[PDB]
Structure 1
Amino acid sequence: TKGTSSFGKRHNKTHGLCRRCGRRSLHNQKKVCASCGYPAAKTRKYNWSEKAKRRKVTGTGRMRYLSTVPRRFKNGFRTGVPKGARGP
């Protein structure tokens, strides 16, 4: 009875949602995320899984601040207002 009848007793949870990465990988007894390694400071990644690295590498998300950096570099990180522009 290791199959169909034993599958009926599965109503607990080993993993919950992790606050850092959003996956259901936070082990509920060890309080450690199996994916990102929370609450360790460094995000968990390994070089034997290039797929796992590419699933969470920079650019797979929003680039909320980092996408505006090349334009500011191209303009030389200038500060101020265009000459004669309306304002205060």
Structure 2
Amino acid sequence: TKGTSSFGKRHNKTHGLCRRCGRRSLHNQKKVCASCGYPAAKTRKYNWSEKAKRRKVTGTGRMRYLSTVPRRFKNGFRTGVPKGARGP
């Protein structure tokens, strides 16, 4: 009875939702995420899984600040306004 009958007893949760990475991989009793390794300061990644590294590497998300950096570099991190521009 280790199969179908035993499967009816599965109604708890080993993992909850992690606040840092969003996956349902936060072990509720150890309070440690199996995916990203929260609450450790570093994010968990290993060199034996290139797939797991490329699932969460930079560029797979929104790039909210970092996408604007090359344009600012290209124009030389200048400040101010164009000459004669309308404003204050």
TM-score range, shorter chain: over 0.9
Please report how far the alpha carbon of residue 3 of structure 1 lies from its aligned counterpart in structure 2 after TM superposition: 0.1
Corresponding residue of 2:9: 9
Structure 2 unaligned regions, length at least 5: none
Please report how far the alpha carbon of residue 49 of structure 1 lies from its aligned counterpart in structure 2 after TM superposition: 0.1
Residues 47-81 of structure 1: per-residue CA shift (max 9 Å, x gap): 00000000000000000000000000000000000
Please report how far the alpha carbon of residue 85 of structure 1 lies from its aligned counterpart in structure 2 after TM superposition: 0.3
Question: Secondary structure of 1:25's match?
Answer: strand
Structure 1 unaligned regions, length at least 5: none
Work out the percentage of aligned pairs sharing the same amino acid.
100
Instruction: Find the aligned partners of 1:78 and 1:39 in 2 and give their Cα distance.
Output: 39
Please report how far the alpha carbon of residue 16 of structure 1 lies from its aligned counterpart in structure 2 after TM superposition: 0.2
Question: Secondary structure of 2:67's match?
Answer: helix
Corresponding residue of 1:63: 63
Question: Secondary structure of 1:62's match?
Answer: coil
TM-score using structure 2 length: 1.00
CA RMSD of aligned residues (A): 0.2
Q: Which runs of 4+ in 1 moved over 6 A?
A: none
Instruction: Find the aligned partners of 1:5 and 1:25 in 2 and give their Cα distance.
Output: 26
Instruction: Find the aligned partners of 1:42 and 1:85 in 2 and give their Cα distance.
Output: 46
Q: How many residues align?
A: 88
Instruction: Find the aligned partners of 1:28 and 1:21 in 2 and give their Cα distance.
Output: 15
